Design a protein around this ligand. Sequence first.
Ligand code: 5GP
Ligand code: 5GP
Lengths: 166, 166
Amino acid sequence: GMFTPGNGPVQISAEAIKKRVEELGGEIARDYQGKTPHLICVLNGAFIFMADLVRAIPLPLTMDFIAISSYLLKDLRLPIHGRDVIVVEDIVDTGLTLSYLLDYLEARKPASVRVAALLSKPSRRQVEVPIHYLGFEIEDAYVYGYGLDRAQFDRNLPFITSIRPE
Amino acid sequence: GMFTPGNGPVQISAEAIKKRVEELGGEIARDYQGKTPHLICVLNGAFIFMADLVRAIPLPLTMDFIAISSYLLKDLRLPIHGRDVIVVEDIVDTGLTLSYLLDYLEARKPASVRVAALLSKPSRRQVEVPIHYLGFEIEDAYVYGYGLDRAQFDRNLPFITSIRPE
Ligand SMILES: Nc1nc2c(ncn2[C@@H]2O[C@H](COP(=O)(O)O)[C@@H](O)[C@H]2O)c(=O)[nH]1
Ligand SMILES: Nc1nc2c(ncn2[C@@H]2O[C@H](COP(=O)(O)O)[C@@H](O)[C@H]2O)c(=O)[nH]1
């Protein structure tokens, strides 16, 4: 029993991920100095990114967890009105899901909204959505690991890997 | 801006936590060899423990996330009937919540159910519940950090700390 990488074109080590997440955390801490952000994790794929990210943000903050599908499974529990909100996503593909979520959150009138996403495949972008804190921009490929699944499996791989289009 | 420990009687470093979680992961991997566990994370407090734990279990597995309160906020999404289920909890206090959850899960007839909890305060136990994979047994105190909150705050501290009864 060992963690094995797929043969896809995208591969990112736990160490590389670790270093990038720490930089993003430091960036957020700096940008939100003097404030109390409310980080909203988009389940299920972003829960590991969320876990590592928050531990790299030396600020007083709160968090929530929600589920959403393309075209809202889990609702918000804490108020976001007037809060400085930070959405934590796993990967931005077409951008549809994030687009719906941002409109949903904006309807409640938060003080501000910024987005943190571990990955982004801009060649697949169909709706322009903002990503203020991006881990890595990658080519078009189906990735998995580090929270992201492959038919519900492989969310436990400590690294990001992928399969071939075939 | 820096992570600061409270003055309570319970203090556990990120390093100590890291080492213990890795041992538990190795234990699960060994016990569940040849099987495909389904880990159910009890939100919100156990999401960091969950993130680190799964990355220390070199086995094919699936996961889900649910919310529950003393005396069921977020429901199950994946089937558990016939599955070898592992509940991932943050801390066992009176044991009431875990007791309800186990009965809930058992009603669906899983193949087996085992429990992993980062912490346990047995002096506060009112209902005997099983913990097959325990991180640390601690004295009675209100802890926070590493996913656990203090009025919704401090879930981001990379270590477990606590406050004084006063
Ligand atoms: N596991 C995995 N999920 C993906 C990938 N690309 C997109 N997704 C899923 O699709 C969701 C939204 O994609 P989008 O709405 O931007 O098209 C993401 O949050 C993610 O859960 C991928 O390459 N691997
Ligand atoms: N943050 C924090 N939460 C606790 C503590 N003790 C109990 N809880 C919360 O209460 C829930 C269940 O407690 P129980 O049902 O065993 O009495 C736990 O899952 C946890 O969320 C504590 O010391 N600190």
